[PDB]
What does this fold into?
Amino acid sequence: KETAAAKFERQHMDSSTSAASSSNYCNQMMKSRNLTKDRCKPVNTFVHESLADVQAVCSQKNVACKNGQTNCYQSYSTMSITDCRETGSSKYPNCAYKTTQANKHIIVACEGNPYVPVHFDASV
It folds into this structure.
């Protein structure tokens, strides 16, 4: 099955654009990445940076993850990110999202060898 690393790429990496270009970014991306297949995933963040810059977070600032785990890392720099949040009108299978573009620090949980991001914790 899909690896945790690959799922991370699928769910959160958008190196093809440097920012969301229209309010429909979220609707399009959430659908195209298969995040609304089984249900409308309520929230999702996409990161507009190269994979190697995101992977590099795993060797940046170690912080506790929201749930208490100690394998989280916070990026030294801000990153271009797109926040996607389910709208009051969202109704499966027509999931609908609000797009919010921002430059923030990202926090990811890392695992394995190579030690890479497997989960998006938060943006600060």
About this structure: The chain is about 20% helix and 35% strand. The chain has one domain: 1-124. Helices lie at 4-12, 25-32, 51-55.
